[PDB]
Write a protein that binds this DNA or RNA. Structure first.
Ligand SMILES: [Mg+2]
Ligand SMILES: [Mg+2]
Ligand SMILES: [Mg+2]
Ligand SMILES: [Mg+2]
Length: 52
RNA sequence: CGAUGUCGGCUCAUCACAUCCUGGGGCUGAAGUAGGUCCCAAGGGUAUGGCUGUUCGCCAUUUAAAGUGGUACGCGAGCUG
């Protein structure tokens, strides 16, 4: 029993065009701190500053 | 290898200067206050705690600053385990 329907539709547009991705992995930043581990491998792992 | 005992903490330190603070200066994108940077300088000073066995670290609250390291990563014929 066809009656007047008031239906809608959306049309969103966007370019989506880029080539610029910056991780900023420049080592002027990124302070590095080295320390030793908890220690389970005897005398060696407590002496080696392995963690970072 | 017919013995050179090991991290951390406590204690006691001592020297180096690539100096965290105080002192003396240059330069400044230094008006002033407050900072940045570099040079000279080691005389003295150079946190208390929550969490972890932890050094470190994170966090809270300060302080003029809560320096970086060597010293069997100082110290078990001194201690803890
Ligand atoms: Mg000034
Ligand atoms: Mg304590
Ligand atoms: Mg602490
Ligand atoms: Mg000891």
């Amino acid at each position: 029993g066809g009656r007047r329907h008031t239906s809608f539709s959306s049309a969103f547009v966007y370019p989506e065009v880029d080539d610029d991705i910056d991780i900023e992995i420049n080592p002027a930043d990124l302070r590095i701190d080295v320390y030793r581990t908890s220690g389970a491998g005897g005398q060696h792992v407590n002496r080696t500053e392995s963690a970072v």
